[PDB]
Design a protein around this ligand. Sequence first.
Ligand SMILES: [Ca+2]
Ligand code: NA
Lengths: 63, 281
Amino acid sequence: KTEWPELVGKSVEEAKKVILQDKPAAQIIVLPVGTIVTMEARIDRVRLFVDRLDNIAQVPRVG
Amino acid sequence: AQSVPYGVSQIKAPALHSQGYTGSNVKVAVIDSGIDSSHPDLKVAGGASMVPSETNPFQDNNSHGTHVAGTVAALNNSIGVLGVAPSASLYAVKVLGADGSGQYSWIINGIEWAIANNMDVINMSLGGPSGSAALKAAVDKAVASGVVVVAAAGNEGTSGSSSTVGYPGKYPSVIAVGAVDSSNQRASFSSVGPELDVMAPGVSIQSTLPGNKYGAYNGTSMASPHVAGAAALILSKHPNWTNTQVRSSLENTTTKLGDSFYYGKGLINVQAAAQHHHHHH
Ligand SMILES: [Ca+2]
Ligand code: NA
């Protein structure tokens, strides 16, 4: 599993929990949706882009 | 002893170095997380930070900007790696914080700094899935002002027949760069779409890292500075060429690979780009 479309609209807390069940060694970083980010590929990383209410606003994916 | 990373050889940068051209006097802004100016394999000529809480552009708290910078311009000496354009004047334009992210206004402020300080080339190994009018205006302005603007195409992989190139790479004025490996195969993460312009090495790319280290990174972030460095090599051999001409020289002399949806025009070849007469190999 490398993408979690079912997590869009969920809390960032639930997203971290679910992602760590599927990928326990994931390096999760929470960032504001609508920011610009580095374009290196990290297979250990899952960025979580959140709206101003701390709900997931973009499909989480490994990278 | 110095090592020449495979990607520098793959884009045929050593052919320009042997002709005597290494990017001297060409000003390249690495608009990124900073550049560790204490690294002995880098020489940083200047810069500025647009990150409110990290005001020193010569401190790279992420590592990404320093790696990108080394692919552009790691020094030609007896250590570490060799850069594509090892004599280029390198500027640290810090618009990303430690966590790898920046607000659109920080990126735009960095592009404006680059324009105001007469940069010849901008590299943006960065992206996001949406654009903004202000972001498009900044890149268009840089291009109108004569700057070669190069960006990572993005690491979004494929999505059926949809484009997955991110911004600012997706804007027509910006050269969007995808990633291939040492066998010229597109990396599985490399973004796709009609906005993909050219490809460069983006798999297992050795470069400089903060605290006098080196290491292999993957990404269209790694591919972009091969093309920004190539632009600097071209300009050092043809200092009157416009950005229009530099861009066309790179596009018109790629080694064609697969379908342009996945590969754009193919792999850049800076040897061929820097000749007067251009054709694909
Ligand atoms: Ca060196
Ligand atoms: Na573009």
